[PDB]
């Protein structure tokens, strides 16, 4: 059961679906160059064509309208809007203005993500997010988006998963630009978080707008394999690296000193945190976005710099090898209310990848239906406790370019044949439409 | 400047600093005897062989204490007198302390007894010392014997004096005995001392069924950031964790501070020496909290330092040690402990200062020391008006004594000691302190 | 190839023997490691394996049919000492029978003492981390020298201390799966010391002139770019994999650059006693090399040891390992230049590919190609005077491939693990013919 | 001593000149460092110093009366370039006049370009941490070469880059007093790179044969015990103090064992550009050594570089430094064996002792003894063919001794800093006689 004001939704990002990579004045992003770099992405796959959504946006709007979702979440491609530094590209902005206007016409609330990892190559070449100037480049991008789209757009999300864009990209080398440097990584994270707060301030101050704005963090709760002191330190450090490094500056206006000390094996000055920065980072928002996928069971490692490694999990697992963990999702939400925030929470991404077999114009993904149903049940149980999860966005609308895995993994509720660009609904899409329908059918 | 009727004025010493008679009464060498004889470790090879010769002249020193009018006299028991070999109780050594405590009761003086004031027997050291977990049990054999023989006579017990000094200053920084430089040894040493504290409180309250007040003494130095920069805040935090929170958190919160555990992980790569049930024992409820206070430290950030901090320049008035005179920062510290840590009654188990004392025509005009003590007693009074419940103040020290690695080069006493003749001469501060006590009464 | 050149094939005890609880055998670290969750592919073990304990006579005929000069096998420690100080004469009798039979069939037995099957009783006392493991191993080695030195042709003390040490105690991939750099360097030191003591014992106590040596796996390391950063990266990968083992064995010292790099985890080297390094570096008769691939590496600021794997565009095996015969030639040249002038034996070389059985035959041309390129390299190097005296083809049988289990097939003879049927792959016929051709060249 | 042996004495500009804000001079890092609280002994500074800028003629007569062959002094950078790009001819004229007057009095001017007085303007742009410092220093060196090469007898580019680099940017004891290992290695690299560029400029552009070289302070390091730990400690102390500077200068490379140890703080070496090390290792005419003492070291698990000072039972100077003439001999033999065959000059040797002025005389028999033992060692080494071509006694005058201020007296001539009176110590008379005795020996 869900409340009458509960928002069902689905979501995508620009580089994962759009394609048309050198069309409409678009110039290359870090992910274009990363896909072309040897050994970084699965079988050299890229987002040149992707789901061809830039051309086929109208067909996909109908699919969204057919699902009956209250809200559609999408991201704006920075390299379409500012293909060069200081050079606005109005053709790029028109596409999004048309996309948002068409969604509104169809009774669909547009929820817009400003940054979903597609940094322009001109920005990267000046240091990217490692450079403090990146705060001001992003503000020019945001200003132009607010000025042209704030009358149409229903909600703004400044940043999607700064852990991925920051740590996974600059420390672990898995995402673009694929660096392995903790110093660059903490500087990148700080400038993303600061750009978040400057953008919120700009919307509410300069533009005098009451459009709901917030951030989205990916959160993965961390559990100790045993109750030994070592394994408690492992959990703590994993929690701090994945969660508290981002939650503390956003809601407390401080970085966790335990992680600062732990990172001091690589980071030997924090003078990049200027005075006034953490107050701006912690500027009050209208909601809090959460991307949730799984937990991580950890144990202690004497040979790890950050004192933790992954432990063996006996849980049921997705196609990615990630734990299916709705009980731990409930722990996470409870903790955020206890420790961090009383803001309305939106689950801005939840979903799963399974080995989907297309067989005779049909995809039987009972496993994806299970996953989503367990989490929606966990959302309903939490709302009965008073945890205030106002909405939920199913990731993803269609099968799309899944980053370093390429098209090898399929997260979509709608199947996509990538050589014909045919959309075929999966059983989970039918099920999800009917969940929204059955919900809507009983409400006033 | 006024103190409640139940307020306790006192003075204090430790065994190795004053007793002398190092090879007499069955006493075998401690870590400090061998440290003093190890080259480059102590000022001009000075040692505690003779010291104040207090072991022979205890009666004379009781008269001085009696004349001062102090409610309480704090002294330490020498472990190597009581257990000169492992498992070998020496009853002659115990007899001295029984006599000492009995005589103090006769002269109307409350005896406050420190079990461990750094004088670890050499036999313990040779088996690994405090780095070894058996050190918990060796200390418990020592403490059991002391409780059995003296609990009826002694007014209050102090398990450990300054585990930071015995642990970090001794096993990490290498300044005190046994002078090691190993962070892993150091955190094992600290842990076993703290665990031996908790086991002894448990022992006295449970085995002996005694209600005699027991607690610990920690030396606490509040830490201040030179500037408001993030770097300097990290420096303050890490200095405060290293000096203070590493000891406060296990005692009162039953946990170690994880920010310091992570910082120490540059050297310490497993915390499995912390067994399950240890931190609950370490944090066993005490009857009072003991604080040794001397100064603050102003710190700034250092990128080249493993713990991210160095000392910054201080413009404050300084003692003969070069330590800041810091009564305001003492007030910050007490307020913080009430706000974050404990509501137990606090005893300032050591406070004092070293200055360049000159004997002139049979007198020592140590007005600088008087000033120092006075500024802190004023702080104690002002803090008690706020409800901070500092129930006692012990002036360090009774006699000029052996000042550890500085030797006899530094004089902390309120009674001057000519170490050639062993003559006791009252400094101006002793007469002043005796009169402060009278005034209170 | 020269007339004295030895062709061989090789196995290890836990990988093929099976009969895990039979003949008085007690568990090893690998038995337990297989039965720990998440450590081995689909929980596979060496309980049954190739059933070679029972079927050894059949396999002796296969070896004989191959025409190999030498067969290399390992002795299972837990069969010889199933409990501490408790000698098992049944366990020894098997290996005595095996070696005598091979001698009767005209085959040289080359014997590996330690191939990773540490008894559980030794692990429960600390294992290789404990200095007493040197003495435990000597008791094991003494018994093997006493009962077999007359029968055996050559002795190999240790197989791949990098694997048994660093992969096992630092990286956690092999048994017992620990992740502690301090345990790892002690483990390695005691393995290398036990080697040195065992060589001293054979030549001193027993007065024997039987050829003895050690086997190190070696993987040459290459910098992605010519920058200073990537030179450090290569230096450190090389030190971690190769120099940490080569320097003590041949120079009687550890490389200080690695000691300094390891000092982020290791804060005392007092486990290296006086006399140990002179014992570790005791003169051997040959040097053994297990070779498989190179590694292309680059610099990483976020890595404690300053290197990570760089993208390789080389042809790869079924394992993803680079097929790297040119780099094999670089390595051998380096060893003659820097380290040793002893006769080299390639004690393991081979590859794994996706082998299918079709119509009673395995068409492993990929494996033939691999082996051919390396045998060519050996022949080229021996023309330069590099003195590679022999080559063993890993492996005789498809076997238990450690953390990969039975998912990976390295054998020249296919094994159906359900039936225990031996089927010759194309590579076995080919290799037998390579040997035949070499023999036909000899006068 | 041999017929071509050079006896000398030495000073540096900030230590003796004073006149800090006169002649167009702007502040150096040391002026600002002296005004920074807690850095220098009782806030002492080089404002007046020995007032040698005004009293240079008197001090020349003292040098003349000493009978030294050579006088080594340094040029104050802020007198020559008080602002970036602005040449100051009044400042240059002073050093031209000084050098000319020394030539007229039969004295060889040996000139040090950099003796730690970096102009403040250079500091405010990052200083030695900035790669531009190489070019700033080259503009300064060019101007000195253009105006003084005819007059000057020998050039020293840099004095003690260990102090100006590691003691200044890592340990925080000298100006600008930073504690950052990353800044420290960049500083050292740029100093060494500026050395090599300056040597190239003198021999290439100016086409000059004037002898040029670097001066390194060298402290040989010794293990307390024979244990492995203590060998690592000695190795690391030697690398930090000596090999880090010797290897680039003579081998064109940095020692990788130290790069690995410094990687706890230094996470990229891209500041070392291609070509730099070949420029740094450009061939010089002589090698300069500042020698003072040894250091006995032992292992420390709590230390990042694995070493701490060990107790020494040697006779000590007033600084607490070991009097170590035997160890000096070890150093010189090591340099010939491992590094260079250039003629060596001891560009600084000397000692501080608690000098008391008594009845217009200073009885510094302790300083006499020290210098005698080292001059004996020099003579003994030259009998072995070690080719020490000269000795400069540090110092001519009691002077501003850096972070110790005027609390420590290294001079052979006493200076009453309250009155600026020069008074010859017994060592000065003695030293003059030693030179006299040596001259009387030559035909």
Author numbering:
A (entry chain A): 2 to 445
B (entry chain B): 1 to 441
C (entry chain C), D (entry chain D): 3 to 445
Please quote the authors directly.
β-glucosidases are key enzymes in cellulose depolymerization, acting synergistically with endoglucanases and cellobiohydrolases. Recently, we have characterized a cold-adapted member from Exiguobacterium antarcticum B7 (EaBglA) with higher kcat over mesophilic counterparts at 30 °C141516. Besides being cold-active, EaBglA is also glucose tolerant, indicating that cold-adapted GH1 β-glucosidases might be instrumental to make biofuels production via SSF economically viable. Crystallographic studies showed that the (α/β)8-barrel fold and the catalytic residues Glu162 (acid/base) and Glu350 (nucleophile), typical of GH1 members, are conserved in EaBglA.
The two crystallographic structures of EaBglA, solved in distinct space groups, presented the same tetrameric arrangement. Structural comparisons revealed that the EaBglA subunits assemble in a different way from those of GH1 tetramers available at the Protein Data Bank (PDB), indicating that the tetrameric arrangement of EaBglA is the first of its kind to be reported within the GH1 family. Hydrodynamic studies using SAXS and AUC indicate that the EaBglA tetramer is stable in solution. The tetramer has a 222 symmetry (with a distorted tetrahedral geometry) and two pairs of active sites placed at opposite faces. Each pair shares the same entrance and forms a huge cavity [11393 Å3 ± 216 (mean ± SD)] with a two-fold symmetry. Two types of interface stabilize the EaBglA tetramer (called here α and γ). The γ interface forms a semi-circle wall at the catalytic face of the TIM barrel, connecting the active sites from neighboring subunits. EaBglA crystallized in slightly different conformations, as indicated by the structural superimposition of the independent tetramers observed in the P21 and C2221 crystalline forms. These conformational changes result in variations in the surface area buried into the tetramer interfaces and in the volume of the active sites, suggesting that EaBglA forms a flexible oligomer, which possibly contribute to overcome the structural rigidity imposed by low temperatures.
